[PDB]
Amino acid sequence: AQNPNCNIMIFHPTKEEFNDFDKYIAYMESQGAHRAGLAKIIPPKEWKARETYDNISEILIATPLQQVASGRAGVFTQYHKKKKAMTVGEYRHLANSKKYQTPPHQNFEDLERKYWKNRIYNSPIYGADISGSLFDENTKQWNLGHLGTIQDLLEKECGVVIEGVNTPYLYFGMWKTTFAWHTEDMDLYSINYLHLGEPKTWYVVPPEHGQRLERLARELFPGSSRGCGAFLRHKVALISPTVLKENGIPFNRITQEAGEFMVTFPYGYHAGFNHGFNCAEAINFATPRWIDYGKMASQCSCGEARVTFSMDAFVRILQPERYDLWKRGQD
Numbered sequence: 001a002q003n004p005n006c007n008i009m010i011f012h013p014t015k016e017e018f019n020d021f022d023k024y025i026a027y028m029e030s031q032g033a034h035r036a037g038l039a040k041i042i043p044p045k046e047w048k049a050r051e052t053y054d055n056i057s058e059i060l061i062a063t064p065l066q067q068v069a070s071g072r073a074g075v076f077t078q079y080h081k082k083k084k085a086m087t088v089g090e091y092r093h094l095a096n097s098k099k100y101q102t103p104p105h106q107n108f109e110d111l112e113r114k115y116w117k118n119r120i121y122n123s124p125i126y127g128a129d130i131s132g133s134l135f136d137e138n139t140k141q142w143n144l145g146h147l148g149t150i151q152d153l154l155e156k157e158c159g160v161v162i163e164g165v166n167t168p169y170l171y172f173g174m175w176k177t178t179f180a181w182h183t184e185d186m187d188l189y190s191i192n193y194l195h196l197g198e199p200k201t202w203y204v205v206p207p208e209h210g211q212r213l214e215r216l217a218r219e220l221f222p223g224s225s226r227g228c229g230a231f232l233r234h235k236v237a238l239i240s241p242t243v244l245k246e247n248g249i250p251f252n253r254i255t256q257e258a259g260e261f262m263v264t265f266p267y268g269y270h271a272g273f274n275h276g277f278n279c280a281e282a283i284n285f286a287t288p289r290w291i292d293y294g295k296m297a298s299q300c301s302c303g304e305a306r307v308t309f310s311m312d313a314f315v316r317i318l319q320p321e322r323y324d325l326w327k328r329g330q331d
């Protein structure tokens with residue numbers, strides 16, 4: 001069995017190997033990369049996402065989200081307070097202000113310590129989930145707006161023809177902006193490219209151990225667990241590495257830098273934080289190996305998780321028994 005310790009693997013494809021996306025994902029899985037839940041892909045030196053970023057300040061963040069925490073430093077939830085619209089140029093200046101800027105630090109490890117010590121005492125502002133792309137249309141390799149669609153994958157594997165679309169999303173971050181512990185909708189893959197700026201630290205639980213994380217989360221967030229049998233779908237709960245280690249939960253960590261891709265694999269729980277002002281692009285995708293995960297994915301029916309249009313068909317075809325309850329939670 002490849003990668004039996006479920007370590008995060010790092011890949012350096014050549015320009016030739018970067019042509020066929022699906023083939024390279026299947027290659028990484030042949031080497032056991034999926035067992036970690038997360039892999040890093042360093043593009044060949046000849047590749048570029050776009051020529052410059054010199055022109056991005058005019059993008060609008062229609063609904064910036066202030067991430068307000070409650071709990072203790074290592075075990076907390078966050079709620080998203082909506083703020084007035086601002087441009088990327090306005091948000092970058094805010095990120096770089098004395099109130100929000102990255103503190104002085106020695107290295108990534110010192111910064112990680114400061115994040116876990118102090119996150120809860122601040123409320124950073126995140127521009128999340130902004131439909132759009134920063135890949136140049138002429139970038140033909142690993143262009144996250146030109147991937148094969150999940151609908152087409154389900155059609156090719158299963159024969160069924162469904163409505164829905166699959167487009168990328170932009171994320172503008174600042175120091176302490178936080179992504180809570182989650183798997184993807186329908187336990188899909190994700191791919192994330194860090195276009196520019198400061199790093200992103202990731203934490204991940206191997207898919208084969210995801211239920212260990214779920215059981216700890218039920219213990220640590222007991223009211224939330226009574227409210228919903230899949231409350232991690234709400235994407236609000238944080239648990240620190242120290243707390244994970246105290247409770248014996250297997251996990252790994254890695255820091256993504258600008259110019260690097262990360263892939264999350266089906267049912268790989270992940271969480272993390274941004275080091276400073278940055279911009280990422282991410283999208284969900286599927287492969288044939290996903291289908292079995294999609295069929296087994298938990299679902300929130302309490303009303304909190306509310307998701308895209310396109311998830312309807314996935315539930316309806318892969319999980320017809322759950323469909324009626326889940327759709328009530330959508331409506």
Ligand SMILES: O=C(O)CNC(=O)C(=O)O
Binds near residue numbers: 171190192
């Ligand atoms: O970058 C972020 O804030 C969160 N991204 C992801 O969870 C991902 O790409 O799957």
Ligand SMILES: [Mg+2]
Binds near residue numbers: 058059
């Ligand atoms: Mg612009």
Ligand code: NI
Binds near residue numbers: 182190270
């Ligand atoms: Ni994710």
Ligand SMILES: [Zn+2]
Binds near residue numbers: 230233300303
């Ligand atoms: Zn729920």
